[PDB]
Amino acid sequence: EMEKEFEQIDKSGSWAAIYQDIRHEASDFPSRVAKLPKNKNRNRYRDVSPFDHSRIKLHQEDNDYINASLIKMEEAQRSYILTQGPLPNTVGHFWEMVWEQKSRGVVMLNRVMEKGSLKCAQYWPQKEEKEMIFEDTNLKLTLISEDIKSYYTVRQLELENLTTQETREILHFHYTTWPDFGVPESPASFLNFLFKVRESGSLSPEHGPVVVHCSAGIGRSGTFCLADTCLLLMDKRKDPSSVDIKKVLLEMRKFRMGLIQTADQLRFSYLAVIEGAKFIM
Ligand SMILES: COc1ccc(CN)cc1OC
After folding, report:
1. Taking the CA atoms of the chain, what radius of gyration do you get in angstroms?
2. Beta bridge partners of 158
3. Is the minimum distance from the CB of 73 to ligand 1 under 6 angstroms?
4. Is 73 helix (H, G, I), strand (E, B) or coil?
5. Ligand 1 contact, 159 CB (< 6 A)
6. Do 155 and 174 meet the contact criterion of CB atoms below 8 Å apart?
7. Distance between Cα 228 and ligand 1 center (Å)
8. Which among 81, 90, 108, 180 would be 20 to 30 A from 59, CA to CA?
9. Atom of ligand 1 nearest to the CA of 77
10. How far is CA 76 from CA 205, 230, 248, in A?
């Protein structure tokens, strides 16, 4: 059981050691499309690339590339798109991916500015009456409503395909209180946020995969998917304690490199799953 394993690693201070075994065991697959010189300005970080086998392809003949990966968790019947925070030049590609994949929710785990630098382009409208048009991808985005709470904001957006005049409602879930350094002290507000995404229907098989991002799409984004999948597996299996976080993380790392960036994020993931299990048992 992971609660016991938690106290062991914690009392022994072995987090950096566990974290290193994960780095050494992790899959390595080609990422040739990401490294093409024509894609250099579609990547926020030169060392964070989608694998070719799991990359999301845009349906535009010109250049199909976006820094985005499909995570498929077969046993949990869960799928997530993990992506980077869009760049000024990829905001149109981001919304094209949301459209093409039939996603219902976007989960954002960063602020636009952190540590005095831009981590993400402002890719949604700030006011109802000021909609955004993405000329490159022929989409219009309107803010319908915004509900600001202490730890997170939920926004209802309307995405319109200008080519076909179809419209869809997208939910934007914005976790606004992840600290600039380190991890939250308590996982309570993060669990509340994760249960709110679940309640919306955004993680349900009747929609395309949820889009999850932070700045690189590997650290905070990784914690989100890892916690959701682990808690789901605990409700599915005859023996809940058969759930090994480290195994689940290694499975997800077959689909996108580097998920969970620090030993602190790993410890936080254990804590979130351990605490979430109480509200699930
Ligand atoms: C909605 O369907 C499911 C989603 C997840 C699981 C988890 N093993 C089982 C399901 O069966 C129905």
Report:
1. 19
2. 142, 169
3. no
4. strand
5. no
6. yes
7. 13
8. 108
9. 5
10. 11, 8, 10
* CA atoms within 13 Å, Cβ hemisphere of 194: 24
d(CA 20, CA 14): 10
DSSP for residue 240? G
Asked if 255 and 249 touch (Cβ cutoff 8 Å), the reply is no
Q: Return the amino acid letter for 11.
A: K
**Amino acid present at 212:** V
Q: Which amino acid is present at 271?
A: L
* Alpha carbons 156 and 51: distance in angstroms, whole number: 32
Please identify, by atom number, the ligand 1 atom nearest to the C-alpha of residue 235. 7
Q: How many domains does the chain have?
A: 1
* Cα–Cα distance for residue pair 232/277, rounded to 1 Å: 10
Structure-solving method: X-ray
- For 126, the token pair is 């700030």
* Residues annotated as catalytic (active site), given as ranges: 214
Instruction: Please tell me the number of Cα atoms within 13 Å of 226 on its side-chain side.
Output: 33
Task: For ligand 1, atom 2, name the residue with the nearest CA.
Answer: 77
Distance, in Å, from the CA atom of 38 to the CA atom of 161, rounded to the nearest integer, reads: 27
Sequence-distant (6+) residues with CB within 8 A of 192 are: 151
Which ligand 1 atom lies nearest to the CA of residue 232?
A: 7
CB-count burial class (<10 Å; 0-12, 13-18, 19+) for 151 = middle
Distance 232 CA to ligand 1 centre (A): 9
Which residues carry a binding-site annotation for substrate? 180, 214-220, 261
CB of 76 sitting under 6 A from ligand 1: yes
Q: Which residues are annotated as a binding site?
A: 180, 214-220, 261
Give the residue numbers spanning the domain of 35: 1-281
Is 236 close to ligand 1, i.e. is its CB under 6 Å away? yes
Q: Is 77 in the pocket of ligand 1 (CB under 6 A)?
A: yes
